[PDB]
Design a protein around this nucleic acid. Structure first.
Ligand SMILES: Nc1ncnc2c1ncn2[C@@H]1O[C@H](CSCC[C@H](N)C(=O)O)[C@@H](O)[C@H]1O
Length: 553
DNA sequence: GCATCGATCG
DNA sequence: CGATCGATGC
């Protein structure tokens, strides 16, 4: 179900992190600080951020006027109690919806942790309302609308320090957020906390410190701070252990490895390079990494998007009904005809180059076909057993409103793709993965929703698919990915999405090095008698890829 | 049509 | 620890 905390985003910020954010805000503030400074928290909740910033300000002998807004009355009451029990008298709380979906004069400082509510929980209607009101595109999240609103409620030269999900840094839905941030603020600092797990909830948070633009026109170079968990440590890399708690690591000004308790964290500090190009994800990398990235891009002949279609698997929107392995254990009246049961490949049966399989027994009840040259859903009158099987789940299948709004049948697979494209030789790879697992497939099976597949644009997969495979499975491409597309989940899992794989560079497919790579990949995928010679061939491929683009790192 | 996005989700 | 899977946007 969807808990009230899930729909309202009621997660409170830990004490030490709040203090760190408040201290950075008061360090970046360069505006008078002798009069009463107004501070705003548009989603104050418990009032933790206001308490932290007031503690720091009273440490600096700075008088604040704290203002909190929250549409829940229990949060208002507890925040009022906590603020009264402190030694502060000048505060004010407002029980209202901040997005306004009285009056308030503009503010000098904004410290905020807005709620992160995805588009599915908001519903399409409120999502389109928020998009129309705050000029947002794509799958809007609530914190983006909150950013727009709280920025509109801020003075010129005022400092914002706001912690949100980091996903706006790399997704295409965060394009609008990146555009807004770079349009309205002189970016002071962007801290990607990565997988440090400060909150009990599963989220990778990022903090944004900025100064709102004026009109006299200003300068400063935007810097970033990235910290991630490091599982694989290089032998020649030294680790620093001069810090006890993780909260002490957010005040380090030297990049490198730091050991805290049971974990080792890689910390990088550098500059944001040209954030005005908000189209592509904002690359947070050091100088050497960025120069290597730019050199690889300059020496590249093209990209995968120019050579091959990168499609997603089937999205049935009812996996428990359409994809099963126990088709023979069902009653004989409901066992569908084998004409409809097509073998499928999931993300679990995924190795590099090629998997041996076991028949998987995983088969999908494919509901579409090529009738009169077009893609049409099947007729259940021809398949009575499949009709009965689907009548068994009619309740769950007909509860999909988006299917009925499209004037489509209730028993259909939502995204069936083209039934004739499955027979083409293709590359397959899983989405969620710590390592690239791209492999070749000839037998003409269907691809699962947790996987993507690749088919050539020109009708000659004779060599291009093999070259793309040899490129994608290399450590070179892994470094390129970790530099360019920084979308990671917990435990080092990268996201191999279409918007990321389309930007994989490709060397000249008629180079001698490229042809040797193609031959080596053919040997790897065809013959399966190799064991640890696979590592030798892979290292040879690495050296050939290096010679294809440029030499080493 | 078809790829996204996840205060992930047990 | 580890790999979602179904509403959603365009
Ligand atoms: N539309 C809205 N307008 C105002 N407050 C809202 C809101 N939607 C959610 N909230 C409030 O936002 C809070 C998110 S929890 C954040 C608490 C606090 N900012 C902290 O970091 O400690 C909740 O208390 C919720 O009641």
């Amino acid at each position: 179900t969807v808990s009230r905390q899930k729909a309202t985003g009621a997660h409170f910020t830990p004490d030490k992190l709040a203090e760190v954010i408040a201290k950075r805000i008061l360090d970046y503030f360069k505006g008078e600080k002798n009069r009463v400074i107004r501070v705003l928290d548009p989603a104050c909740g418990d009032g933790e951020l206001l308490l932290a910033i007031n503690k720091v300000a009273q440490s600096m002998n700075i008088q604040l006027e704290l203002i909190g807004v929250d549409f829940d009355i229990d949060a208002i009451n507890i925040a009022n109690e906590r603020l009264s029990r402190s030694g502060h008298k000048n505060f004010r709380l407002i029980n209202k919806d901040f997005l306004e979906m009285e009056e308030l004069e503009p503010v000098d400082i904004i410290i905020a942790n807005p709620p992160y509510v995805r588009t599915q929980i908001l519903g399409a209607e409120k999502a389109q309302k928020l998009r129309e009101k705050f000029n947002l595109k794509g799958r809007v999240d609530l914190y983006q609308a909150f950013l727009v609103a709280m920025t509109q409620q801020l003075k010129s030269n005022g400092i914002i320090g706001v912690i949100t999900s980091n996903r706006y840094l790399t997704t295409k839905g965060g394009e609008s957020t990146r555009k807004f941030l770079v349009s309205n603020f002189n970016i002071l600092e962007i801290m990607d906390l990565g997988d440090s797990k400060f909150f009990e909830a599963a989220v990778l948070p990022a903090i944004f410190f900025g100064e709102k633009k004026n009109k006299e026109y200003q300068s400063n170079v935007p810097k970033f701070f990235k910290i991630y968990e490091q599982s694989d440590i290089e032998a020649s890399s030294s680790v620093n252990s001069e810090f006890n708690s993780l909260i002490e690591l957010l005040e380090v000004n030297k990049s490198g490895l730091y050991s805290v308790e049971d974990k080792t964290y890689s910390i990088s500090l550098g500059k944001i390079i040209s954030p005005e190009n908000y189209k592509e994800p904002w690359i947070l990398a050091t100088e050497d990494e960025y120069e290597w990235f730019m050199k690889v891009n300059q020496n590249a002949y093209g990209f995968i998007e120019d050579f091959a279609h990168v499609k997603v698997g089937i999205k049935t929107t009812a996996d428990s009904v359409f994809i099963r392995s126990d088709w023979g254990e069902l009653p004989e009246e409901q066992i569908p005809e084998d004409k409809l049961l097509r073998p499928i490949i999931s993300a679990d049966q995924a190795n590099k180059w090629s998997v041996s399989l076991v028949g998987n027994n995983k088969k999908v009840l494919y509901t579409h076909e090529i009738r009169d040259g077009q893609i049409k859903a099947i007729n259940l009158e021809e398949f009575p057993r499949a009709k009965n099987y689907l009548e068994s789940h009619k309740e769950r299948l007909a509860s999909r409103k988006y299917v009925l709004k499209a004037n489509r049948n209730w028993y259909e697979i939502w995204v069936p793709h083209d039934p004739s494209l499955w027979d083409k030789p293709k590359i397959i790879f899983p989405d969620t993965s710590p390592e690239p697992k791209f492999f070749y497939e000839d037998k003409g099976s269907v691809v699962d929703g947790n996987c993507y597949w690749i088919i050539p644009k020109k009708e000659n997969s004779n060599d291009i698919l093999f070259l793309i495979m040899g490129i994608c499975n290399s450590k070179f491409m892994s470094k390129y990915h970790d530099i360019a597309f920084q979308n990671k989940l917990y435990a080092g899992r990268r996201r191999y999405l279409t918007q990321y794989v389309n930007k994989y560079p490709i060397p000249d497919p008629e180079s001698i090095y490229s042809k040797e790579i193609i031959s080596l990949v053919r040997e790897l995928v065809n013959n399966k008698k190799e064991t640890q010679d696979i590592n030798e061939i892979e290292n040879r491929i690495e050296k050939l890829i290096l010679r294809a683009f440029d030499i080493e790192s």
